[PDB]
Amino acid sequence: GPSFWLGNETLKVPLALFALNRQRLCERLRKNPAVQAGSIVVLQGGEETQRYCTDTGVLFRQESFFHWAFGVTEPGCYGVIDVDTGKSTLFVPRLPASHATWMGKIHSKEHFKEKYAVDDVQYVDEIASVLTSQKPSVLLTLRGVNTDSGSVCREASFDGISKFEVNNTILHPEIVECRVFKTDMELEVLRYTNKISSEAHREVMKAVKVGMKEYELESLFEHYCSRGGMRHSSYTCICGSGENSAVLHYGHAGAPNDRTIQNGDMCLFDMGGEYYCFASDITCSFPANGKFTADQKAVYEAVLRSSRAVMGAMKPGVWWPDMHRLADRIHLEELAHMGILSGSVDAMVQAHLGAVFMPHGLGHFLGIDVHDVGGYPEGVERIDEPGLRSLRTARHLQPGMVLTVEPGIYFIDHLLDEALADPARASFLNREVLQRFRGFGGVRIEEDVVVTDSGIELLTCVPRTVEEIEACMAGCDK
Amino acid sequence: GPSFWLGNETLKVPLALFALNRQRLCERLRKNPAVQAGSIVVLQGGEETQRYCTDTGVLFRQESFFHWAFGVTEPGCYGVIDVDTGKSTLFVPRLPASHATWMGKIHSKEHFKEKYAVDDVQYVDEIASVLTSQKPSVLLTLRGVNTDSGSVCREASFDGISKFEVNNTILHPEIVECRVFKTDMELEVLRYTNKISSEAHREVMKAVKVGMKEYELESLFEHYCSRGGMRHSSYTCICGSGENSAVLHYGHAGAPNDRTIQNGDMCLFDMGGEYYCFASDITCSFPANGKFTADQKAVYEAVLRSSRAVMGAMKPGVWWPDMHRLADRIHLEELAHMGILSGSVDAMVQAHLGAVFMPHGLGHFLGIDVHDVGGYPEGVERIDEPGLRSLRTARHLQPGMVLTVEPGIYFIDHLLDEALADPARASFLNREVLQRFRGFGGVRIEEDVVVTDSGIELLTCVPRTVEEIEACMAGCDKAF
Ligand code: PRO
Ligand code: PRO
Ligand SMILES: [Cl-]
Ligand SMILES: [Mn+2]
Ligand SMILES: [Mn+2]
Ligand SMILES: [Mn+2]
Ligand SMILES: [Mn+2]
Ligand code: NA
Ligand code: NA
Ligand SMILES: [O-]
Ligand SMILES: [O-]
């Protein structure tokens, strides 16, 4: 069948990928006792937007659930799926003649049917008439809460929908659950996004020089990715140098990658391109001047140790919060070896000291969204403890899940000062040694992995050992 | 005073630029007989957004009026200006402690006061109390219609605003009129955006090779611009090759710069970086293989002729629609000299034949928005004729306006076929020559210019003659 392709060496993505997702969704819905015979899933695609009140167009990126189900890149569409038969219908805008002048060819409905390999295509203005003819029992629409943003998903609406029976509770948990488990076709796309993003990270490590602005490396990364067919990034590039490497989502408008990289700084670059709305998320940490100091090597190798320990322990049935605590324990052991900490590591763990150094979650589901859906389905509770409460899932691992593994150690003044004021934590901290690390920034090492039947598959391929990184930055051939 | 600067060779932009805009707005409002003593301008800044229901953040770019007045890059702010005194107060978010971990330093109010050179800084949740204490007569808020999008500007609102008298009609036309006329400080920024975008266009012409995808050149352009501190483009890059060069806003999600460039194609690349929310908009047209054919040279030089004629005629007092008609006439003359058209050019103009080949407006105001505000203030009407109806302004030129000059000639099948079906237009077209230009695409030559006291200043600096373009594509130093 047809494939999405941007030519050159970009990945050909079969539209069969989305057909399989529709089939999988129907199979889940058919097993749901609340689902009535003759139900139709109704999804509404994203629409074109502009900046504020201006006519400045924003490049359109499809809504993630709609993309998962249909792979459609055009704005203004709807898509429906008959649950009992799996039959798919795409609804496309009926365009005015002037579109031909300003926007491009006015494709026929048959063109879209062949392009997307759906069973039928109709115009958007006919959706009520078409659905009416199908005599559905109920329309299943999308409404639920995203557990990372707290936002409510926007349910489909069209002129005349009030004449139908509509259910907006059944679908969301079911389609979320399908998205949690990646098909082999989806994994192929995630291997490509990781390949290109990994290559771009390597080019960035080779290019970094003292005196550059952080945004120069954002620029280079996005150039490499967009040359590889990625018009979008998965999230705003985080290019933190020096003390900014301790700022977890650095790079947003309020802190816009505008610092000059100085000799002796650590760099923490968290960047990932997006291909056909599939994410990647990779973090590389390294010295700006290409040579780890003793202190930098010690912190860096501590995070390398926890990274490797977590990846090695991951397999079906492992509880993700246990991986987070494993990383905590390793960091505390290493910080104790360094002399930053003293005492019983068991006692440090009881006092939640790990969270002073890693305040974020160990890692998260990744897919069509970088912080992918389904981390906290009904029955899965957030753990109300430092560090763990920031975990984006408390689930047990199963084959087909895709996770980031991103331990880090940071020296964050307000967390350190808090710990130093607390007699339950202060006795573990050696102020005279810690002082040397004030302003160090931080290290994060982030890999993307897939859970397999017996372990994991690593998607990411960047230099990771101190020797590998220094060789890469020194411009060595291999 | 303080400046916005992204280091290296980027432009230092004094925050005095925005103080001058606030002063100009106050001066204009003080002269407005309907403005009450003790009025305060109240603007609401943009807020950060995410993709749909996800937590995927969208890089925040400030709302344009708020930017014009304050230059503030942070989301979630408000800004007020006392009309009678000119005193400015910025309201910033009161951030949670966790911001320090995830987002960065929690800057003090004094930090923002020094950064933006405003008179006072307060937290946003205190806006009702602060304004109550100042005892304003009226709050002047922003509401009006953008004449390019048809959208209504978002009026400021805050909890407790219902306790104040609010006027939402006075401000919009006045602040729009201030934006229409660029200060010398604003022109410095527009010169920088044009410099970097021009250089990026030159790099693209030097790099293009037959066999590339259009999006590879979009990628190169944005790389050059972002290396120069332009994190955003002014609009989505239009990289049309072959027949796609006849599609005016090609490059959007539905037609995403995904064609392979072929030998013999013309390229039409309309791209412009944005620096600190100031736009650029430049179009370069050239042969993909670096050598104009005779047919390509003829079409290209027709548009070069109208470009230069319009630039030569522009000065204060000139009616912009007259410039559009001048370009139409030149295109028709040259298409006749090429043998594509025959008969009386005067008759062709009466039949609106120019619009078949240039269906869009000659050019538009440019500023903080690429299609800048104020093209159609009250009393200025849109002309209901082919081509002219797409003009984004029907104003007379005055010093300080910034305009694009962007004539083009395209071979658009449904427009050509309409003309051939119309007895009033069909006889002018010579099908035996025209057939050769089906699928040609088109040529557009777009310069950014400033209206001066007596003429124009050209901002754009790219190769324009056939000889200059072929030299650029052959890798010649720009000085040559
Ligand atoms: O937001 C998160 O979960 C991870 C933590 C480090 C940056 N991204
Ligand atoms: O929208 C406009 O007015 C111009 C016409 C060509 C592309 N941009
Ligand atoms: Cl013809
Ligand atoms: Mn990351
Ligand atoms: Mn991540
Ligand atoms: Mn343009
Ligand atoms: Mn333009
Ligand atoms: Na293992
Ligand atoms: Na070239
Ligand atoms: O991350
Ligand atoms: O343009």
Account of the protein in words:
The structure is a homodimer. In chain A, a hairpin with a 5-residue loop joins strand 6 and strand 7. Chain A starts with a strand and ends in a 5-residue tail after the last helix. Chain A has a six-stranded mixed sheet, covered by helices on one side. A three-stranded antiparallel sheet of chain A has the order 12-13-15. Helix content of chain A is 34%, strand content 14%. With 478 residues, chain A is α+β, with helices and mostly antiparallel strands. Chain A is built from 16 helices and 20 strands. Chain A folds into two domains: 1-180, Creatinase/prolidase N-terminal domain (Creatine Amidinohydrolase, Chain A, domain 1), CATH 3.40.350; 181-478, Alpha-Beta Complex (Creatine Amidinohydrolase). In chain A, helix 7 (184-207) crosses helix 8 (214-227). Chain A has helices spanning 16-30, 64-70, 99-102, 109-116, 127-134, 171-180, 184-207, 214-227, 294-313, 320-337, 345-350, 354-357, 413-421, 423-426, 431-434, 466-473; strands at residues 3-4, 13-14, 40-44, 49-50, 57-58, 78-82, 88-92, 120-123, 139-140, 166-167, 232-233, 238-241, 266-271, 273-274, 282-287, 402-405, 408-410, 442-444, 447-451, 456-458. Residues 281, 364, 404, 406, 446 of chain A line the site of one manganese (II) ion (MN).
List the helices and strands and how they pair.
2 copies of one chain form a homodimer.
Chain A: E1 3-4, E2 13-14, H1 16-30, E3 40-44, E4 49-50, E5 57-58, H2 64-70, E6 78-82, E7 88-92, H3 99-102, H4 109-116, E8 120-123, H5 127-134, E9 139-140, E10 166-167, H6 171-180, H7 184-207, H8 214-227, E11 232-233, E12 238-241, E13 266-271, E14 273-274, E15 282-287, H9 294-313, H10 320-337, H11 345-350, H12 354-357, E16 402-405, E17 408-410, H13 413-421, H14 423-426, H15 431-434, E18 442-444, E19 447-451, E20 456-458, H16 466-473
Parallel strand pairs in A: 3-9, 7-8, 9-10
Antiparallel strand pairs in A: 1-2, 3-6, 4-5, 6-7, 11-14, 12-13, 13-15, 16-19, 17-18, 19-20
One manganese (II) ion binds near residues 270, 281, 283 and 446 of chain B.
